[PDB]
Structures are given as C-alpha cells and as structure tokens.
C-alpha cells in the first residue's frame, strides 16, 4: 500500500545487505544485482510500415522503488506488514522465528549467529559472482524477447512476397 523507507542504520545483526539494497551513488535507485541483470540483457524499419511499439505504463524507476519498498518492509517489519500495518521487530528475533517455523528451536540461531551471517554473506557473494560470470542464467527472459522479435520480422518479410500477382509494389501496379 505504502512505499517504505529503509533506515540509514545498517545494524542488521551482522547480515550484510549492501548488495541488494538500493544504491544511493547511482543515477537511478537500482541495486548492484539489478544493474548487473539489466546489463546482462532496426527498430525504425518496423515503425516505418505502421507497426508502433507503445511504452510501458510503469517506468523502470517506479518498479525499482516498489522493489526497494518490498525489501525494506521485509527486512524491517518481517511479514506483519503484509496483513495489516507495519510492526518493527529486531532482525535476529525475526530470523529466530523463521527457524521456529520449520521445526528447529530458536536457540540455535543465538548459538551460531556469526556463522550464519558469514554463510549468508558468502552465499550472496557467490550468487553475485555466478551472475557476473555466465550469461545464460537469464535464458527464460531472453527467449521471450527473441521470440517476439522473430514474429515481427516474418511480418515485414511477408511484404516482399507477390502472392501470385505481377509485382509486390502497390505503387508499381
């Protein structure tokens, strides 16, 4: 319902969130992962025959703001902002509850807090490196665009056929 704002304090129990939080020192608010994905993934000719491409209603900056608000709410208020109002809660308590939700007692989190934080940081670093190195990981998106483009090409190519007449140029006949 409402765009949330992450606090300037980054004391999230040792969980380093700098990779996915919005980047302030950037022209836009897209994060490092978001910009990496954006970088990972002739037009006039189609328009020249009456095939227009409309612009999307929501620009990329609005989507980035929505995503940033969702992350801020998730990291600050847990899940309580989904149902009603936002209820602030310590992040460690939220993680203990998320462990309690899957059978294990909460005490485990407070026995291995630093180890879990280090594991999560290493995991986000590894996923960032995996996205940086290979380019096929975003195949599902890419195909879509390619597929769409292919169709349009064929349409324009259909303007070159004669369909049995003397010539394919309307002005000529």
């Amino acid at each position: 319902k409402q765009i949330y704002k992450t606090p300037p304090i980054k004391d999230f129990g040792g969980f380093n969130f700098s990779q996915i939080l919005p980047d302030p020192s950037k022209p836009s608010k897209r994060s490092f992962i978001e910009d990496l994905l954006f970088n990972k993934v002739l037009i006039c000719a189609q328009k020249f025959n009456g095939l227009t491409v409309l612009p999307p209603l929501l620009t990329d900056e609005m989507i980035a703001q929505y995503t940033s608000a969702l992350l801020a709410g998730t990291i600050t208020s847990g899940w309580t902002f989904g149902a009603g109002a936002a209820l602030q809660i310590p992040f460690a308590m939220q993680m203990a509850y998320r462990f309690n939700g899957i059978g294990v007692t909460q005490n485990v989190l407070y026995e291995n807090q630093k180890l879990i934080a280090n594991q999560f940081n290493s995991a986000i670093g590894k996923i960032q490196d995996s996205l940086s190195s290979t380019a096929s990981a975003l195949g599902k998106l890419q195909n879509v665009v390619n597929q769409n483009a292919q169709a349009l090409n064929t349409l324009v190519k259909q303007l070159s056929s004669n369909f049995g007449a003397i010539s394919s140029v309307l002005n000529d006949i």
Binding site: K5, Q88, P90
Partner: protein, 48 residues
C-alpha cells in the same frame, strides 16, 4: 475552474519504520473485516 490535468503518478505515500536493536511493536486491539472476491465460472452456452 474545472479542467483536465496531467501529472506524474504517486506510488502511494511515503512511510518510514523506526528500526533499532531492541524495539518491538505489539498490537493491543483487532478488527474483524469482510472482503468480497468475485470470480467468473462459465460463459453462455451457444452453437452455430
């Protein structure tokens, strides 16, 4: 007077949450609500 205007969308209001080490917000009251959800099931049977 009244006229047609154009502007930039607002994605709702702006809100901030006072996160800290040892602060917790606990509700004291509740509200029972009723929400309507409408789903289509079938069209008009027809033949030609």
């Amino acid at each position: 007077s009244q006229s047609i205007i154009a502007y930039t969308m607002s994605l709702g209001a702006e809100n901030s949450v006072a996160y800290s080490n040892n602060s917790i917000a606990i509700p004291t009251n509740f509200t029972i609500s009723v929400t309507t959800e409408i789903l289509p099931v079938s069209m008009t049977k027809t033949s030609v």
